[PDB]
Amino acid sequence: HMAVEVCVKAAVGAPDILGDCPFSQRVLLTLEEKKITYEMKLVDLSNKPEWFLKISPEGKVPVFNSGDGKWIADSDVITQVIEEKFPTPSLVTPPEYASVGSKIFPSFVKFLKSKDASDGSEKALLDELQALDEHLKAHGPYISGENVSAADLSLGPKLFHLQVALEHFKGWKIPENLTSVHAYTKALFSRESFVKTKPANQYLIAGWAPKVN
Amino acid sequence: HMAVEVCVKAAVGAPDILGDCPFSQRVLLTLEEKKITYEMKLVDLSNKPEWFLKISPEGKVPVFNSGDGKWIADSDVITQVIEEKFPTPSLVTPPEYASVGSKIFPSFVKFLKSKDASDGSEKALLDELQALDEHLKAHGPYISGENVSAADLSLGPKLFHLQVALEHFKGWKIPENLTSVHAYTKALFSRESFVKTKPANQYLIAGWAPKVN
């Protein structure tokens, strides 16, 4: 029977280069951490190939094959299907810590797209990071203590995008007085799985550039 | 080891009565169709019990246990975790038909909440149902032909809510010139699994009533 497969976003105009999808990176982080043998198939969404449109006709990424031939979409769905089919090593996050940092990504996009300083977007984002800092100071170094879980593989890519896009477009960085957020991103981003699956800053910025204007 | 379990919304003030959650009904429809032995645990969200807040601390429904002790949320996640752990009988919808009727439910809520007739909400909903009718006329009686799949178990509850809430609050019904939508809802709603898991019209209307005003 079939191999384990994942289709993710490639850099625009470079089909052999990994793109900036943070939902695709969550799935890649899961597959790496569980030491599963798989194949990453890159798709340039501005030039959707024949084989891709067969597998995912609505052109959405990521799409995953567990080796059964049935292609499934949505990174929440995918990472949970992976947890069931490949339970060891466990990456289960306790439900008490499931929604930790849930509003950081929407607040990041809100502040990035912003043109007004009286917007309240910066404060709303800062308040969201202050809450994450408090949670990490109390129950860290990761979302669920001493070990990396699913919630980290989801939030990690989102904080990476926040870091690169806000520095480039705004000159804004997660403030250093948020010591627990910083130890968290320092620890998470330096992981063998993150370093491998992270997009080059270049493609992250290029991807966000049209949405900023 | 543990039993298969699902926590769903109960009628407000009646913990022994099945509530109106259409995402919970999708999961119940999946569990019935796959002839899986499970237990439905009812939760009155206006009076969240002790045991429930342990299992799902963010108070969200549905929540599901496949018998491993690990509670999971989101009906898209749940129904796909069920498809992997219990593949026979298959309920896989081909991805080509995955997004069929995707905008019907948001358009229904838009038109229900509406106070203006010049809103364009009615037409937007009608256009969405006309497209579903065309798809069903061409590739029916269900979303994926002759047999019921996952997409039907998702859309079915949504069309049921649309039917009951729009008749009660607006005097609006899916027009009868949409013959394929009607054969579809006639076939789907009469199924042993639907009849069993459907909320009483009463609790559907009561649930929507505060959101209409």
Place of tokens 């979303």: B143
Enter the resolution in angstroms: 2.5
Q: Are residues B33 and B55 in contact, defined by beta-carbon separation less than 8 angstroms?
A: no
Q: What is the DSSP letter of A44?
A: -
Backbone angles phi, psi at B8, to 5 degrees: -130, 170
CB-closest option in A58, A87, A95 to B57? A95
Per-residue exposure over B46-75, b if at least 16 CB sit within 10 Å of its own CB, e if not: eeeeeebeebbbeebbbbbbbeeebbbbbb
CA B80 – CA B137 distance, rounded (Å): 27
Report all structural domains of chain B as residue ranges with CATH numbers, in order of start: 1-91 (3.40.30.10), 92-213 (1.20.1050.10)
Q: CA dist A213 to A113, A169, A206, A208, B32, Å?
A: 8, 10, 11, 9, 50
Question: Taking Cα atoms as reference points, which of B143, B145, B142, B147 lies closest to residue B98?
Answer: B143
Q: How far apart are CA B205 and CA B212, in angstroms?
A: 10
Length of chain A: 213
Residue in this structure with the two tokens 């926590």, named with its chain if needed: B7
Residue numbers in B near A76 (CB within 8 A): 74, 76-77
d(CA B102, CA B129): 10
For residue A131 the two structure tokens come to 């809450």
For residues B85 and B31, is the Cβ–Cβ distance under 8 A? no
The alpha helices in chain B, defined as continuous H runs, are: 22-33, 50-55, 75-85, 104-113, 121-139, 150-170, 179-190, 192-197, 201-212
The CA–CA distances, whole Å, from B212 to A207, B80, B114, B171, B209 equal 40, 33, 8, 14, 5
Helix (H) or strand (E) holding A153: helix A150-170
For helices A104-113 and A121-139, angle between their N-to-C axes, nearest 10 degrees: 150
Interface of A with B in 164-203 (CB under 8 A): none
Distance, in Å, from the CA atom of A109 to the CA atom of A212, rounded to the nearest integer, reads 9
User: Taking a C-beta distance cutoff of 8 angstroms, is the pair A147, A92 a contact?
Assistant: no
Elucidation technique: X-ray
In angstroms, rounded to a whole number, what is the distance separating the alpha carbons of residues B153 and B170? 26
Query: Which residue is associated with the tokens 């939030």?
Result: A155
Chain A contact present for B4, CB below 8 A: no
- Computed on alpha carbons and rounded to an integer, the radius of gyration of chain B in Å comes to 17
Active site residue B21: yes
**Chain B nearest C-alpha distance from A58 (Å):** 7
For residues A1 and A172, what is the distance between their CA atoms, to the nearest angstrom? 49
Cα separation, B146 vs B159, in Å, equals 19
| Cβ atoms B9, B45 nearer than 8 A | yes
DSSP A97-110: GTTTTTTHHHHHHH
Phi, psi of A7 (to 5 degrees): -100, 125
